[PDB]
Subunit: 419 residues, 4 copies
């Protein structure tokens, strides 16, 4: 396994260019399964998740190719199954379900198992599909779906807010008979992006971005060219990178409107933030960040994807911070790792109390999940001495060349195919 070897303390400063959103590219790649014509998705970051998606798409009899773009030829889809291998590697493989059943009348996907950060059930996906008129059964650990002819429009109310289930139900409804109404739908920028992608293809959708999505079924989906939005989570991680290192920074290729809460939290931290129409600028004035209070919740509130990062920010901040996590059950893995580094913290249920310390100490830590890994990398950057982050493979699923981007910021980092 690769590892990162980092040395600090180090002031993170400079310019950085945001990559396409991991969370927009994924659901759009799966949506392409609905397209009968050549498709061109632009601004797709290079990630292990995209690789696994191209690999899975190919397995489905799809024609895939990439650079900054990813060329998709879904005209010939031949197989209808996502093997245990793929789902195991990438949860998002569940996304092939809706499109497959909507276009082909059948589809199978290995029932995901527990996750690093939570049980992560797909109950809502299956449920939405059933509402759409698909027959679903569990066999050999396989979620078996099928429908006779076309899916049927329906008024579906979501139990809880789910990004993934909204993508799943939204996607399949595009090809169904009638009108679909997804109530209590996720408002995530990536939901909007995926809906727009679907509309580019000839779908009838409205309300994307609000708690209510209306879809009018159409005979088929063509093809086109779509540019995935900027990654709000990568952007956030960089703003933070600067905010905890007394540095300054400018984010090129960003979409400020997707991160209001994060920006508000940064300001509450004592950050000097300014925004353009495609750029964000943060300045710490050499100052130490102030502790803030954080409560994760669905968009546009504070995203759970920024959580590990904010904890880090609280850990080297002046004051006592409190972080409450409402989306994921086991999303504190980063904490004990940071303590190993000299941070003071206490966990109580779904909340962690942060007692800011002046400086961090280099140590050997373990990446457990993607966004915590990026938190550990950032911790290494500011901590004293050497920090080695084991299992940086997590980082590589959701981050495109993070070592390089950090390096350009003045980071002392080496990817090590060691020990």
């Amino acid at each position: 396994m690769d590892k990162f070897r980092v040395q600090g303390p180090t002031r993170l400063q400079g310019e950085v260019t945001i990559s396409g959103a991991k969370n927009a590219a994924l659901p759009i790649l799966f949506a392409a399964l609905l397209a009968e014509e050549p498709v061109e998705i632009q601004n797709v970051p290079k990630l292990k998740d995209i690789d696994t998606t191209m690999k899975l798409l190919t397995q489905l009899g799809t024609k895939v190719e990439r650079x900054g773009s990813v060329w998709i030829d879904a005209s010939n889809v031949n197989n209808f199954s996502a093997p245990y291998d793929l789902v195991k590697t990438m949860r998002a493989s569940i996304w092939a379900l809706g499109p497959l059943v909507a276009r082909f009348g059948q589809g199978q996907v290995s029932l995901p198992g527990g996750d690093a950060i939570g049980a992560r059930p797909v109950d809502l996906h299956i449920f939405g599909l059933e509402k759409l008129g698909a027959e679903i059964k569990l066999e050999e650990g396989y979620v078996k779906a099928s429908v006779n002819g076309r899916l049927k429009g329906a008024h579906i109310v979501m139990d809880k807010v789910s990004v993934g289930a909204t993508v799943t139900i939204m996607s399949a409804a595009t090809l169904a008979e009638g009108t679909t109404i997804i109530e209590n739908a996720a408002r995530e920028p990536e939901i909007v992006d995926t809906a727009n992608f679907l509309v580019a293809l000839g779908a009838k959708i409205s309300g994307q971005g609000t708690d209510r999505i209306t879809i009018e079924g159409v005979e088929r989906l063509g093809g086109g060219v779509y540019r995935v939005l900027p990654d709000r989570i990568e952007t956030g991680t960089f703003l933070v990178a600067a905010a905890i290192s007394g540095g300054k920074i400018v984010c090129r290729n960003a979409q400020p409107d997707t991160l209001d809460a994060v920006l508000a939290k940064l300001r509450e931290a004592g950050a000097d933030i300014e925004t353009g129409e495609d750029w964000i600028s943060l300045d710490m004035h050499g100052k130490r960040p102030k502790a803030v209070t954080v409560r994760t919740a669905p968009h546009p509130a504070f995203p759970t994807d920024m959580q590990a990062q904010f904890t880090l920010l609280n850990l080297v901040a002046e004051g006592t911070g409190v972080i409450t996590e409402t989306i994921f059950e086991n999303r504190f893995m980063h904490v004990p790792e940071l303590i190993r580094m000299g941070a003071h913290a206490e966990i109580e249920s779904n909340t962690v109390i942060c007692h800011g310390v002046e400086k961090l100490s280099g140590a050997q830590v373990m990446a457990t999940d993607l966004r915590a890994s990026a938190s550990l990398v950032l911790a290494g950057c500011i901590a004293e001495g050497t920090t080695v982050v084991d299992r940086i493979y997590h980082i590589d699923r959701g981050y495109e060349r993070i070592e390089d981007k950090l390096r350009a910021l003045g980071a002392n980092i080496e990817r090590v195919k060691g020990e």
Copy 2:
């Protein structure tokens, strides 16, 4: 002191006309503090809470009078405070805050104390105001706010979804200099209703009903005529009345689109439902309800105000149901009371596991919650023998003559005064 005597088991069936929403009439009644001209609010239910707002209003130097409607004249407001006594009996009293300091540059409201259901801080209200330029301080239990001149519109991202704080900020913003953007705003129907009422007065509002409300501060508010929307909770309660009694019912004067989550849940419990534009039809077909799973959350998800009612539904349903509460948490007072009647249930944190039973037994129970404890009267209706619900002043707070409506559905119930 007021008590309900109920005899069952009794099949609930017939017709019912839904009154005006308590939760829409309250905030509109306080927003009236902004109008410099005679205002008439139509379709106001006759509730103890409405009497209290009237009382609070009068003491502000306000001209108030009611019947079907409530006549308001706030051109002469001289007193700027909500006393301890009123805030005690009536929590919504805090709503006087925003309008007062927006309109007169000042306001005082007693800080609400302990609440059985979950404790309920108003941090969000205060914070919101402060974001608008108001200076706030705590004195002798009173939240004191003031502003030199006019409030300044701001970009406010809510830490959490708050019906109350949203109304406070939305209301006050109508009179500020500039634009106010409320991100992560509550989507409640009563919010659309209050925004609409504010516009009827001369306010510039948009986004009401979505997570992003925009307010263009205007110079002053006039007066007008506005009809309060139907009561969604009262509707669901009656719907549940039929669903738990093998009954059949028709709701007249309803606004179906405000209760999709409740309609969907009911369907899941085996109910045959149909809707028109101002009516809702429910039929159990003599059927005992099917256990279901509930998760309260912000609108349009499952409403915490329907919670105790659904716990009842679960308690006498086939199978094991689960009620999880994310808004109030300690909102399970009805449970032990129902266990007094034969129900089988365990409370684990913010969740109640429901073990459905065939029959309930009449017994003496205690009302405590203004919406929860209508559940005890519903339970009385279908329970074996005689049930006495003490302290019915609770139901009188949120339910307009519930015994008259129940009686017309075929219930054996009598309001025994004093004892």
Copy 3:
């Protein structure tokens, strides 16, 4: 209703004599139901709760008289039921259950309803009796028990650590045919106190105070005289009164060994402590307390009955404090009351995060818990100006003359007759 008018701030200094424990007196009074001959219980505090138990005993046909002692003659008990009204005034009434069935083969108690601090089910009580051979049915809110012949000893492993259930099962077992083992029994000092009492009556018990209590049933219990232990919560509460007021105090007629957790906690808050066989001295050296961390759990861990008091301590302590409640998840009524007084806290589920402030301010607050009540009176002592605590009926239930005790310490406190 009665009330407390308190004026501060006031440093709490002096001596106090600890009363007999409310919590040992109660179960011992109920156990006296098993005695065939006159019984004398010494050191019984004068409390509303003792009044109520006396009333209940009398209704059963018990002969009861009191001063410092309580005189009992249960030789001619003729009635076997605890009525709705009694149980509603004081839940300990459920304690009549076990002794009635074991001795008379029959017993009826009104099923306790919802509680302020938590649902407080009595499933373990009922279950344990059933394990001993009692037949039990729920009729009109009454837990009707009966045992064809004589109770039978059984091996009982408790699902949860329960003071109430351990007392009920233990009392009943004394008259059971055979042997009874209570595995995972509560270790509360009061459990030990009640067990010695039973022994003094001729019962065969051992293990009291440890995880497994063994009871060798006997044909009959006679009479005797028993001296109740000192009230640990009263003791802890006075300790807190000095630890939060930079004062000094000595407790007379105390039992240090029953409060090690509280003592250790106090030390951490920076208190100078000394103890002897029957006394405890607390010296804050004029110092403000250091925020501490608290986790309620079964004895000998930190007692949930000291919880609200430590919350108060954290509230005026230096630093950020954390209070976690594992016995009663809703035991936070006092927090918002304290917030009304200038305190700074956030409630996250079963945990309250305390941010110590320099001073508190007088305000009108409402008592609710026969323990937060005390906390509010303490806060009044150290707060700036005038504090009024409504509903002090609560205090009277758990504290014997708390105003004279405080008064003797320097407290400016007056009992107002309603206004």
Copy 4:
């Protein structure tokens, strides 16, 4: 990286011998560090952890060798540190801390990070040692302890019931100056076990098994011969194995009173059990298990180590069943895996509602926990079809030849390897 291959449905029945308990051998093996004369530890199971423990022992400069028993020679203990690699592969490595600082005046151990089942902080181990006078610092991920001369005994009250912290403080105190008192100590059979081992070495200990452990510091410890006690968890796992299958079983070298809670639950599940001073016999009578309720708490209540095992039982049992976990935050990993097998389960916070299903289908699943692992395997042992369990290394951590044992019990299990 091997993986079990399983096939069913198979009826588990017959006779199995119980190995030494993993939980006693470990801390006992660590207490060895104190023994000046060769010690012979008996009944030690062949476990990955036992090997890793020996490896760790060796590194400190200790003679270690084994078979059925382990030989230790702490005579020439030269080295003072636990290496990152060891602490990483085995958390229990923190155990070497008390012995090192007690016996050698110094001791360093790599700070454990996050755990599979939860954060698992060692705050109590550290805080305790400090009560003993040890100076402790964190440097480079290393917990650094040292003491000027000898550890002074002190009165210590445990914030929480920690088995590990109870072993560490008890162990270190055996060589302390004066008497040590551990209040609110863990009561686990493994503490009784370890305490006995320590006394056997010439140390003064009492209270072991109760909530109060008293230690009188002695001048030094020597050798001896000690036999570890029977593995309660293994016994429970086997008893369950035989209960979920409808079979019969008999455990050898069992010690029944270490598991009263598990036994009673099995009876609630309708299983015919009998005990003898040495052995345990479970007979399902070909009957299917009955859904039960479970709450994990410290010994003697239901152990968390039997949690996953009981979820399985509930999963394939008649009716719904509830399981609540109070010891570990993230201990439901096995659930999603189980669902992959066709089980109906809902997770709510720290509670899992188990909907008993008639049958389980073979499927590929992932072992994650050294306790759930056994759960998946058992699941296969009764599932219709073929089941492959990945990363079965977990089993090897606390399971001596479990495939062998299961096979003797009539199971279709094969340890596939390679790939």
